[PDB]
Short mmCIF file of C-alpha atoms and ligand atoms in Angstrom, two decimals:
data_model
loop_
_atom_site.label_atom_id
_atom_site.label_comp_id
_atom_site.label_asym_id
_atom_site.label_seq_id
_atom_site.Cartn_x
_atom_site.Cartn_y
_atom_site.Cartn_z
CA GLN A 1441 154.75 -52.77 109.05
CA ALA A 1442 151.21 -52.30 110.35
CA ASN A 1443 150.41 -49.96 107.40
CA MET A 1444 150.91 -52.79 104.90
CA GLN A 1445 148.74 -55.02 107.12
CA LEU A 1446 146.06 -52.29 107.14
CA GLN A 1447 145.85 -51.90 103.33
CA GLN A 1448 146.19 -55.63 102.54
CA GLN A 1449 143.02 -56.14 104.58
CA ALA A 1450 141.15 -54.11 101.94
CA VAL A 1451 142.31 -56.11 98.90
CA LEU A 1452 139.45 -58.61 98.46
CA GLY A 1453 136.77 -55.91 98.84
CA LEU A 1454 138.65 -53.71 96.39
CA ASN A 1455 138.75 -56.57 93.82
CA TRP A 1456 134.99 -56.95 94.35
CA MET A 1457 134.23 -53.25 93.85
CA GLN A 1458 136.60 -52.79 90.89
CA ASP A 1459 136.28 -56.05 89.00
CA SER A 1460 132.99 -57.81 89.81
CA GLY A 1461 129.80 -57.76 87.77
CA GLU A 1462 128.06 -58.16 91.15
CA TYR A 1463 129.15 -54.71 92.29
CA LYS A 1464 127.99 -53.26 88.95
CA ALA A 1465 124.62 -55.00 89.37
CA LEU A 1466 124.24 -53.57 92.88
CA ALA A 1467 124.89 -50.07 91.46
CA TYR A 1468 122.32 -50.55 88.67
CA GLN A 1469 119.91 -52.02 91.25
CA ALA A 1470 120.24 -48.91 93.46
CA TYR A 1471 119.75 -46.43 90.59
CA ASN A 1472 116.88 -48.43 89.10
CA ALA A 1473 115.17 -48.39 92.52
CA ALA A 1474 116.00 -44.68 92.75
CA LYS A 1475 114.21 -43.92 89.45
CA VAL A 1476 111.13 -45.84 90.63
CA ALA A 1477 111.11 -43.97 93.96
CA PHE A 1478 111.57 -40.65 92.15
CA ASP A 1479 108.79 -41.52 89.67
CA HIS A 1480 106.40 -42.26 92.55
CA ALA A 1481 107.51 -39.38 94.77
CA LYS A 1482 104.79 -37.03 95.94
CA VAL A 1483 105.80 -33.53 96.98
CA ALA A 1484 103.79 -30.93 98.95
CA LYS A 1485 102.13 -28.13 96.95
CA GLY A 1486 104.48 -25.20 96.21
CA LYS A 1487 107.58 -27.39 96.61
CA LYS A 1488 109.88 -28.74 93.87
CA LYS A 1489 111.35 -32.28 93.81
CA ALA A 1490 114.92 -32.46 95.11
CA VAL A 1491 117.18 -35.50 95.12
CA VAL A 1492 120.17 -35.31 97.41
CA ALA A 1493 123.26 -37.28 96.36
CA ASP A 1494 126.61 -38.06 97.92
CA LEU A 1495 129.53 -38.11 95.46
CA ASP A 1496 132.39 -40.30 96.60
CA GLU A 1497 131.54 -44.00 96.09
CA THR A 1498 127.96 -42.99 95.26
CA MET A 1499 128.24 -41.09 91.97
CA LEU A 1500 132.04 -40.88 91.60
CA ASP A 1501 134.30 -43.93 91.64
CA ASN A 1502 137.57 -43.23 93.48
CA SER A 1503 138.70 -46.87 93.52
CA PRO A 1504 141.97 -46.16 91.63
CA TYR A 1505 143.04 -44.05 94.65
CA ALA A 1506 142.39 -47.09 96.88
CA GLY A 1507 144.40 -49.18 94.39
CA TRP A 1508 147.26 -46.72 94.69
CA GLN A 1509 147.13 -47.05 98.52
CA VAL A 1510 147.27 -50.86 98.32
CA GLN A 1511 150.20 -50.76 95.89
CA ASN A 1512 152.11 -48.28 98.07
CA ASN A 1513 151.08 -49.30 101.63
CA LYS A 1514 149.62 -45.83 102.25
CA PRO A 1515 147.12 -44.70 104.89
CA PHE A 1516 144.48 -42.16 103.87
CA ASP A 1517 146.18 -38.73 103.63
CA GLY A 1518 144.54 -35.43 102.78
CA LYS A 1519 147.18 -34.03 100.42
CA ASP A 1520 147.27 -37.38 98.58
CA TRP A 1521 143.48 -37.12 98.22
CA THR A 1522 143.60 -33.53 96.88
CA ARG A 1523 146.21 -34.65 94.32
CA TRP A 1524 143.89 -37.50 93.30
CA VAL A 1525 140.95 -35.07 92.97
CA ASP A 1526 143.09 -32.71 90.86
CA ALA A 1527 144.30 -35.67 88.74
CA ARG A 1528 140.80 -35.60 87.22
CA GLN A 1529 140.58 -39.35 86.66
CA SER A 1530 137.43 -40.12 88.71
CA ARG A 1531 135.13 -42.67 87.13
CA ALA A 1532 131.34 -42.78 87.36
CA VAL A 1533 129.51 -45.27 89.57
CA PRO A 1534 127.40 -47.44 87.22
CA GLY A 1535 123.96 -45.97 86.63
CA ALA A 1536 124.68 -42.66 88.40
CA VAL A 1537 124.94 -40.42 85.31
CA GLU A 1538 121.73 -41.70 83.72
CA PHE A 1539 119.85 -41.36 87.01
CA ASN A 1540 121.13 -37.84 87.62
CA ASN A 1541 120.20 -36.80 84.09
CA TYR A 1542 116.77 -38.45 84.32
CA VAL A 1543 115.94 -36.51 87.51
CA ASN A 1544 117.09 -33.14 86.15
CA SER A 1545 115.06 -33.57 82.97
CA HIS A 1546 111.86 -34.74 84.72
CA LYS A 1547 110.81 -31.91 87.03
CA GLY A 1548 113.53 -32.56 89.63
CA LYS A 1549 116.95 -31.34 90.75
CA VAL A 1550 119.91 -33.36 92.00
CA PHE A 1551 121.99 -31.57 94.65
CA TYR A 1552 125.49 -32.87 95.37
CA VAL A 1553 126.12 -32.88 99.10
CA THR A 1554 129.72 -33.86 99.44
CA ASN A 1555 132.72 -33.73 101.73
CA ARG A 1556 135.05 -32.98 98.90
CA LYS A 1557 136.43 -29.56 99.92
CA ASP A 1558 134.77 -26.39 98.60
CA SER A 1559 138.11 -24.58 98.59
CA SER A 1560 140.58 -27.00 96.96
CA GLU A 1561 138.51 -29.82 95.49
CA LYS A 1562 135.59 -28.10 93.74
CA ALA A 1563 137.43 -27.57 90.40
CA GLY A 1564 138.57 -31.18 89.88
CA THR A 1565 135.16 -32.42 91.02
CA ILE A 1566 133.14 -30.28 88.59
CA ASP A 1567 135.60 -31.06 85.75
CA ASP A 1568 135.20 -34.82 86.29
CA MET A 1569 131.41 -34.71 86.51
CA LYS A 1570 131.22 -32.67 83.31
CA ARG A 1571 133.55 -35.14 81.55
CA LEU A 1572 131.57 -38.14 82.86
CA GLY A 1573 128.33 -36.69 81.48
CA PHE A 1574 126.47 -35.43 84.57
CA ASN A 1575 124.08 -32.60 83.59
CA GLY A 1576 123.37 -29.64 85.89
CA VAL A 1577 126.83 -29.36 87.44
CA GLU A 1578 126.58 -25.58 87.83
CA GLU A 1579 128.14 -24.17 91.02
CA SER A 1580 124.85 -23.85 92.94
CA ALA A 1581 124.15 -27.62 92.65
CA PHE A 1582 127.06 -28.38 95.00
CA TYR A 1583 127.08 -28.24 98.77
CA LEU A 1584 130.75 -29.00 99.31
CA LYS A 1585 132.51 -29.26 102.69
CA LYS A 1586 133.55 -26.10 104.47
CA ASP A 1587 134.54 -27.24 107.96
CA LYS A 1588 131.90 -29.75 109.14
CA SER A 1589 131.49 -33.25 107.71
CA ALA A 1590 127.94 -33.76 109.08
CA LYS A 1591 125.42 -33.22 106.27
CA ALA A 1592 121.97 -32.44 107.74
CA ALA A 1593 122.49 -28.65 107.85
CA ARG A 1594 123.18 -28.69 104.09
CA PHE A 1595 120.03 -30.76 103.52
CA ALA A 1596 118.16 -28.10 105.51
CA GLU A 1597 119.63 -25.34 103.30
CA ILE A 1598 118.18 -27.09 100.26
CA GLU A 1599 114.72 -27.28 101.90
CA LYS A 1600 114.89 -23.54 102.69
CA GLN A 1601 114.86 -22.85 98.94
CA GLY A 1602 111.44 -24.50 98.60
CA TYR A 1603 112.61 -27.96 97.60
CA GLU A 1604 111.22 -31.11 99.15
CA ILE A 1605 113.86 -33.83 99.24
CA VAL A 1606 112.17 -36.96 97.88
CA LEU A 1607 115.26 -39.17 97.94
CA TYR A 1608 118.76 -39.40 99.48
CA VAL A 1609 121.46 -41.43 97.69
CA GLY A 1610 124.72 -42.60 99.34
CA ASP A 1611 127.16 -45.36 100.39
CA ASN A 1612 127.32 -44.17 104.01
CA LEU A 1613 124.41 -43.96 106.51
CA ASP A 1614 125.56 -40.39 107.24
CA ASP A 1615 124.42 -39.55 103.67
CA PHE A 1616 120.85 -39.82 105.03
CA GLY A 1617 121.10 -37.42 107.96
CA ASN A 1618 122.90 -36.89 111.27
CA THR A 1619 121.17 -39.49 113.45
CA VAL A 1620 124.25 -41.72 113.70
CA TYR A 1621 127.10 -39.38 112.66
CA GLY A 1622 130.18 -40.34 114.75
CA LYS A 1623 128.36 -43.26 116.39
CA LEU A 1624 129.48 -46.88 116.76
CA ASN A 1625 128.12 -49.66 114.58
CA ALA A 1626 125.59 -50.99 117.12
CA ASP A 1627 123.81 -47.58 117.06
CA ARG A 1628 124.20 -47.42 113.26
CA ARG A 1629 122.57 -50.84 112.77
CA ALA A 1630 119.78 -49.70 115.17
CA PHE A 1631 119.06 -46.67 112.93
CA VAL A 1632 118.88 -49.05 109.95
CA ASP A 1633 116.37 -51.27 111.80
CA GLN A 1634 114.31 -48.19 112.80
CA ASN A 1635 114.14 -47.13 109.14
CA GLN A 1636 113.98 -50.56 107.48
CA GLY A 1637 111.11 -49.53 105.19
CA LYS A 1638 112.93 -46.47 103.75
CA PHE A 1639 115.76 -48.40 102.10
CA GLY A 1640 115.37 -48.70 98.34
CA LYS A 1641 112.66 -46.05 98.64
CA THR A 1642 113.62 -42.77 100.41
CA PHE A 1643 117.18 -43.84 101.28
CA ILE A 1644 119.13 -45.34 98.36
CA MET A 1645 122.24 -47.36 99.24
CA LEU A 1646 125.37 -47.99 97.20
CA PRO A 1647 127.95 -50.58 98.31
CA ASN A 1648 131.29 -49.61 99.79
CA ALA A 1649 133.36 -52.31 101.45
CA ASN A 1650 136.53 -50.17 101.51
CA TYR A 1651 135.91 -47.24 103.88
CA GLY A 1652 133.25 -45.15 105.61
CA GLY A 1653 131.54 -44.27 108.87
CA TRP A 1654 131.19 -48.01 109.45
CA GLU A 1655 134.99 -48.17 109.67
CA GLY A 1656 135.09 -45.52 112.42
CA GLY A 1657 132.12 -47.42 113.87
CA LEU A 1658 134.31 -50.44 114.68
CA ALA A 1659 135.59 -48.92 117.94
CA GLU A 1660 135.47 -45.85 120.16
CA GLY A 1661 137.89 -43.22 118.78
CA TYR A 1662 138.93 -45.59 115.96
CA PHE A 1663 140.17 -42.78 113.70
CA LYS A 1664 142.32 -41.44 116.58
CA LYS A 1665 143.99 -44.85 116.89
CA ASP A 1666 147.31 -45.65 115.26
CA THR A 1667 147.39 -48.19 112.41
CA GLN A 1668 147.84 -51.15 114.84
CA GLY A 1669 144.83 -50.01 116.92
CA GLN A 1670 142.70 -49.86 113.80
CA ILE A 1671 144.00 -53.35 112.84
CA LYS A 1672 143.22 -54.58 116.36
CA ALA A 1673 139.77 -52.92 116.20
CA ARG A 1674 139.05 -54.66 112.86
CA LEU A 1675 140.19 -58.06 114.13
CA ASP A 1676 138.29 -57.64 117.42
CA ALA A 1677 135.13 -56.90 115.43
CA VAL A 1678 135.27 -60.30 113.71
CA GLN A 1679 132.36 -62.55 114.71
CA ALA A 1680 133.71 -66.12 114.47
CA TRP A 1681 132.50 -69.72 114.57
CA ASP A 1682 134.25 -71.80 117.25
CA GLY A 1683 134.98 -74.50 114.63
CA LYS A 1684 133.15 -77.24 116.57
CA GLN B 740 152.51 -68.10 104.80
CA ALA B 741 150.46 -67.26 101.72
CA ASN B 742 147.31 -68.68 103.40
CA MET B 743 147.43 -65.99 106.10
CA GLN B 744 147.98 -63.38 103.37
CA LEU B 745 144.93 -64.77 101.52
CA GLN B 746 142.52 -64.54 104.49
CA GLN B 747 143.84 -61.20 105.81
CA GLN B 748 142.86 -59.72 102.44
CA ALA B 749 139.21 -60.46 103.33
CA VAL B 750 139.20 -58.73 106.73
CA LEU B 751 137.88 -55.25 105.85
CA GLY B 752 135.05 -56.66 103.71
CA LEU B 753 134.18 -59.09 106.48
CA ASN B 754 133.99 -56.21 109.02
CA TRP B 755 131.69 -54.41 106.56
CA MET B 756 129.36 -57.39 106.08
CA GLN B 757 129.27 -58.39 109.76
CA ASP B 758 129.32 -55.05 111.56
CA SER B 759 128.07 -52.23 109.31
CA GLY B 760 124.61 -50.72 109.23
CA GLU B 761 125.36 -50.09 105.53
CA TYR B 762 125.39 -53.81 104.75
CA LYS B 763 122.12 -54.22 106.67
CA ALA B 764 120.59 -51.33 104.69
CA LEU B 765 121.67 -52.93 101.41
CA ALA B 766 119.95 -56.17 102.48
CA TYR B 767 116.73 -54.34 103.43
CA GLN B 768 116.99 -52.37 100.16
CA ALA B 769 117.19 -55.60 98.12
CA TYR B 770 114.24 -57.27 99.90
CA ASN B 771 112.14 -54.10 99.79
CA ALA B 772 112.76 -53.89 96.03
CA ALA B 773 111.99 -57.62 95.82
CA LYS B 774 108.56 -57.15 97.45
CA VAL B 775 107.74 -54.32 95.04
CA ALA B 776 108.81 -56.43 92.03
CA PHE B 777 106.80 -59.39 93.35
CA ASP B 778 103.75 -57.16 93.98
CA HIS B 779 103.89 -55.89 90.38
CA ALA B 780 104.77 -59.23 88.79
CA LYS B 781 102.48 -60.41 86.02
CA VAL B 782 102.36 -64.12 85.27
CA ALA B 783 100.94 -65.91 82.20
CA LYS B 784 97.49 -67.52 82.57
CA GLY B 785 97.60 -71.02 84.10
CA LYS B 786 100.97 -70.36 85.77
CA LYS B 787 101.68 -69.71 89.46
CA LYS B 788 104.15 -67.09 90.78
CA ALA B 789 107.55 -68.55 91.70
CA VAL B 790 110.44 -66.71 93.34
CA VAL B 791 113.80 -68.39 93.07
CA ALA B 792 116.28 -67.72 95.89
CA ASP B 793 119.89 -68.57 96.56
CA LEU B 794 120.69 -69.39 100.20
CA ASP B 795 124.29 -68.72 101.12
CA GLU B 796 124.89 -64.96 101.55
CA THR B 797 121.41 -64.32 100.13
CA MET B 798 119.04 -65.72 102.75
CA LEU B 799 121.51 -67.40 105.12
CA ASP B 800 124.42 -65.56 106.73
CA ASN B 801 127.53 -67.76 106.92
CA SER B 802 129.85 -64.93 107.99
CA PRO B 803 130.91 -66.65 111.26
CA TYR B 804 132.50 -69.39 109.08
CA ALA B 805 134.49 -66.66 107.28
CA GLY B 806 135.43 -65.26 110.71
CA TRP B 807 136.68 -68.69 111.72
CA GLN B 808 138.83 -68.83 108.53
CA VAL B 809 140.37 -65.42 109.27
CA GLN B 810 141.13 -66.37 112.88
CA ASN B 811 142.71 -69.68 111.81
CA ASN B 812 144.34 -68.79 108.44
CA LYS B 813 142.21 -71.42 106.68
CA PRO B 814 141.38 -71.77 102.98
CA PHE B 815 137.87 -72.87 102.04
CA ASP B 816 137.58 -76.63 102.73
CA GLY B 817 134.58 -78.85 102.09
CA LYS B 818 134.65 -80.88 105.31
CA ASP B 819 135.05 -77.64 107.32
CA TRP B 820 131.98 -76.30 105.49
CA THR B 821 129.88 -79.42 106.20
CA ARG B 822 130.82 -79.14 109.89
CA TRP B 823 129.72 -75.48 109.81
CA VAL B 824 126.42 -76.45 108.16
CA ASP B 825 125.85 -79.18 110.77
CA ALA B 826 126.77 -76.72 113.57
CA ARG B 827 123.34 -75.17 112.88
CA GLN B 828 124.40 -71.61 113.70
CA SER B 829 123.55 -69.90 110.38
CA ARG B 830 122.03 -66.46 110.75
CA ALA B 831 119.43 -64.85 108.48
CA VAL B 832 120.33 -62.15 105.96
CA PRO B 833 118.37 -59.03 107.02
CA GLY B 834 114.94 -58.88 105.42
CA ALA B 835 115.10 -62.40 103.93
CA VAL B 836 112.68 -64.13 106.34
CA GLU B 837 109.98 -61.47 106.04
CA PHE B 838 110.29 -61.44 102.24
CA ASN B 839 110.13 -65.22 102.00
CA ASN B 840 107.08 -65.33 104.26
CA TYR B 841 105.38 -62.48 102.39
CA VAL B 842 105.75 -64.31 99.05
CA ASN B 843 104.47 -67.65 100.37
CA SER B 844 101.41 -66.02 101.93
CA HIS B 845 100.52 -63.89 98.88
CA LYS B 846 99.88 -66.33 96.02
CA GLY B 847 103.55 -67.18 95.46
CA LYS B 848 106.17 -69.81 96.27
CA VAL B 849 109.84 -69.34 97.13
CA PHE B 850 112.09 -72.15 95.86
CA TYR B 851 115.57 -72.48 97.37
CA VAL B 852 118.09 -73.21 94.64
CA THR B 853 121.30 -73.83 96.48
CA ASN B 854 124.70 -75.46 96.22
CA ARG B 855 124.53 -76.72 99.74
CA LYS B 856 124.71 -80.51 99.23
CA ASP B 857 121.49 -82.53 98.99
CA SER B 858 123.19 -85.52 100.60
CA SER B 859 125.07 -84.12 103.62
CA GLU B 860 123.89 -80.54 104.06
CA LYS B 861 120.10 -80.69 103.67
CA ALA B 862 119.38 -81.48 107.36
CA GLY B 863 121.40 -78.61 108.88
CA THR B 864 120.04 -76.25 106.22
CA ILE B 865 116.36 -77.05 106.84
CA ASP B 866 116.90 -76.98 110.63
CA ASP B 867 118.44 -73.48 110.46
CA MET B 868 115.75 -72.08 108.17
CA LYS B 869 113.02 -73.43 110.44
CA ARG B 870 114.75 -71.92 113.49
CA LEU B 871 115.24 -68.57 111.71
CA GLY B 872 111.53 -68.39 110.88
CA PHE B 873 111.36 -69.18 107.14
CA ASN B 874 107.94 -70.64 106.26
CA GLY B 875 107.48 -73.33 103.60
CA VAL B 876 110.76 -75.18 104.19
CA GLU B 877 109.26 -78.55 103.24
CA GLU B 878 111.58 -80.87 101.29
CA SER B 879 110.11 -80.08 97.85
CA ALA B 880 110.96 -76.35 98.19
CA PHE B 881 114.69 -77.14 97.96
CA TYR B 882 116.73 -77.76 94.85
CA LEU B 883 120.01 -78.64 96.52
CA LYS B 884 123.26 -79.54 94.74
CA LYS B 885 123.72 -83.06 93.44
CA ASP B 886 126.83 -82.88 91.26
CA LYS B 887 126.57 -79.69 89.16
CA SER B 888 126.90 -76.17 90.55
CA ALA B 889 125.28 -74.44 87.54
CA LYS B 890 121.67 -73.55 88.39
CA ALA B 891 119.65 -73.05 85.17
CA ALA B 892 118.56 -76.70 84.89
CA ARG B 893 117.00 -76.46 88.37
CA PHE B 894 115.23 -73.24 87.37
CA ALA B 895 113.88 -75.14 84.35
CA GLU B 896 112.62 -77.95 86.63
CA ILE B 897 110.59 -75.39 88.56
CA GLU B 898 109.05 -74.02 85.32
CA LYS B 899 108.09 -77.58 84.28
CA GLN B 900 105.73 -77.71 87.27
CA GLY B 901 103.71 -74.78 85.88
CA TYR B 902 105.41 -72.00 87.80
CA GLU B 903 106.53 -68.79 86.15
CA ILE B 904 109.61 -67.40 87.89
CA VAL B 905 108.90 -63.71 88.49
CA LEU B 906 112.08 -62.97 90.42
CA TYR B 907 115.57 -64.38 91.11
CA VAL B 908 117.38 -63.41 94.34
CA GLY B 909 121.13 -63.88 94.93
CA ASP B 910 124.61 -62.50 95.77
CA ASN B 911 126.25 -64.12 92.72
CA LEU B 912 125.41 -63.45 89.03
CA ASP B 913 125.21 -67.24 88.60
CA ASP B 914 122.08 -67.08 90.80
CA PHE B 915 120.33 -65.56 87.74
CA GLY B 916 121.15 -68.22 85.16
CA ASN B 917 124.08 -69.85 83.35
CA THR B 918 125.07 -67.08 80.94
CA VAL B 919 128.36 -66.34 82.72
CA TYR B 920 128.91 -69.48 84.84
CA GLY B 921 132.70 -70.13 84.94
CA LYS B 922 133.46 -66.96 82.97
CA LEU B 923 135.95 -64.19 83.74
CA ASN B 924 134.88 -60.84 85.16
CA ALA B 925 134.98 -58.94 81.84
CA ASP B 926 132.26 -61.29 80.47
CA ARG B 927 130.39 -61.11 83.79
CA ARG B 928 130.31 -57.29 83.74
CA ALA B 929 129.14 -57.50 80.08
CA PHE B 930 126.16 -59.66 81.14
CA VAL B 931 125.34 -57.05 83.80
CA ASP B 932 125.43 -54.27 81.17
CA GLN B 933 123.23 -56.34 78.82
CA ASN B 934 120.66 -56.76 81.60
CA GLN B 935 121.02 -53.37 83.32
CA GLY B 936 117.24 -52.86 83.50
CA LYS B 937 116.54 -56.17 85.29
CA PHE B 938 118.48 -55.36 88.47
CA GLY B 939 116.25 -54.45 91.39
CA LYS B 940 113.36 -55.78 89.30
CA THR B 941 113.70 -59.37 87.95
CA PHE B 942 117.22 -59.96 89.34
CA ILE B 943 117.63 -59.01 93.00
CA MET B 944 121.21 -58.55 94.26
CA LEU B 945 122.62 -58.99 97.74
CA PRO B 946 126.16 -57.83 98.59
CA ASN B 947 129.02 -60.26 99.09
CA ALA B 948 132.54 -58.87 99.21
CA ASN B 949 134.01 -62.10 100.63
CA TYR B 950 133.69 -64.81 97.96
CA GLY B 951 131.85 -65.84 94.79
CA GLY B 952 132.04 -66.36 91.05
CA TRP B 953 133.63 -62.91 90.87
CA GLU B 954 136.58 -64.34 92.80
CA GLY B 955 137.09 -67.13 90.24
CA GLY B 956 136.51 -64.39 87.66
CA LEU B 957 139.77 -62.65 88.59
CA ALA B 958 141.88 -64.97 86.41
CA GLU B 959 141.78 -67.99 84.11
CA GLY B 960 141.71 -71.17 86.25
CA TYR B 961 141.88 -69.08 89.45
CA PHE B 962 140.40 -71.84 91.64
CA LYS B 963 143.01 -74.29 90.27
CA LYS B 964 145.78 -71.93 91.38
CA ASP B 965 147.62 -72.34 94.66
CA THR B 966 147.15 -69.70 97.38
CA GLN B 967 150.01 -67.52 96.01
CA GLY B 968 148.51 -67.60 92.49
CA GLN B 969 145.16 -66.47 93.87
CA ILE B 970 147.00 -63.71 95.83
CA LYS B 971 148.87 -62.73 92.65
CA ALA B 972 145.59 -62.82 90.67
CA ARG B 973 143.94 -60.53 93.25
CA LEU B 974 146.84 -58.07 93.27
CA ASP B 975 147.10 -58.10 89.45
CA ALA B 976 143.40 -57.24 89.26
CA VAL B 977 143.93 -54.00 91.19
CA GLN B 978 143.27 -50.91 89.06
CA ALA B 979 145.57 -48.19 90.45
CA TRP B 980 146.20 -44.46 90.17
CA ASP B 981 149.80 -43.63 89.19
CA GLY B 982 149.97 -41.15 92.11
CA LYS B 983 150.82 -38.17 89.86
MG1 LIG C 1826 130.42 -41.57 99.91
MG1 LIG C 1827 125.19 -67.20 97.47
#
C-alpha cells in the first residue's frame, strides 16, 4: 500500500519535531529573534505595530494528528482534520504564547492569519488558544480561511485598519506573502535568496519537516497526484551522491 | 528488510532539507541572528572574540550522502562516510560562508569543532571549505575528532588561548557543551528549557531532521540496537491523537 509508504516517509521528521530538544531550541530561537525584531521595529507615524502570525505549526502544535496518520496509514483528509480541531487537544509551539503575550502587552497586536476554516474550525481554535494561554484571542484577532488559502489579501485588510505589520511569523514561505504561493521549490528558494536579509528579522521561520507548500513544491500538480505520484515525486527530488 | 524501512522513514525530512525554501530560510535566519549576536557580543578585557562552529549540517551540507543512503538502503557506515568526505563534494549550509567570513574580518575567529576525524577526514574537509569560500581554514582553526565525540574539552582548549567564546553554532545540542551528551530526549528538552533565553543569542541552532543526538535520544542504548530496534524506538516515540 502506497499510503503506508507515504506516511512512513514522515516518521523520522515527526520524531524530530515531537521528541527532540533541537526542535524546541529552534522554536525558542525563532521567538527570541521575533522579540528582538519587534523591540527594534519602527512604524510610520499614525500607525500601530502589528505582528502577523500563522497558527498551524507556528503557534499551534498539531503533531499528534500527524502521529495518528502514521499509526493508521492515513492521507490528509479534511473531515479528519476538523475532528482533530474539535478534539481541542492542540499544543503550543514552544515560545509562541510568551511571544504573543509580550507583543500584545507592549504597544502591539498579534493577528492570527490562518487557513483553519472560519466556519467549522474557529470554535476549537479559539478554545485551544485560550486554554494554552494566548491573550487577545477575541474574534477580531483572527483572519480565518473563507475560500482562498493565499494570505496577502488578509495582510492587506490588517493594514487598512491603520496597522503597520512589523513582523510575519510562520513555518511556510506563504506565511510571508503571495510571491511564491503555488510555485515549485526552485522559485521558492529563489524568493528566499532575494529576501535573505529579512529572515530572523521581518520574516520569522519555524521548522516543519512534515508538510507544507514545500511538499506541493516537489513537482508540478503534486497535490493532484495519487499517493504513488507523490511518493515518486519525493524520491525523484532526492539529490544523491554517486557513492564513488 | 528493516534497513529499507529505516531509510524510507527519513525521506520526507530529506526532501525538506534538500529542496525547500523553508530550510534555506531557517539557515539564513540562524546566521542572521548569529551576526547580530556577534555584533553585540561583549568580551572580557584581554580576551579575543571566538565563535565556535560545528561543521556537519551546520556549515557543511552532507545531504547527498543521506540521499545515497536512501537510494541504496544503507545504514550509516564509517568507511562509507570517509569515502564521502574524500569525494570532496560537500556543499555549504546557506549563510554559513558569509557569516564565517564576517566574523574573521571583524575582530573575531571562527573555530571548527567537529567530529570529522583528524586522521582521515581533515584533508577532504579543508579542501571543501576552501572551495566553498570559507576564509581562515588554516590547520589551527580545526579541532577535529581524535577519540572522543564530546566537545566541551575542545571548547576549553580554545578558552586557554585567551579567547572568550561569544557564540556556539550547531544542529545538535551537543554542539553547545556536554550537559546532555549521551542523554535521552526528556533530559535534552529539559536543558533547552533551562537555557531558553540563549537560543538565537549565545546558542545558534540549525535544523537537522535527518540524524543527531536526538536520534540516539529516542531510547536507552538506541545506537546499540539493531535496525528493527531503532525502527521500534522511532515508532514508540510517536505521540498520537486517539482519532476521537
Ligand atoms: Mg503553518
Ligand atoms: Mg552537526
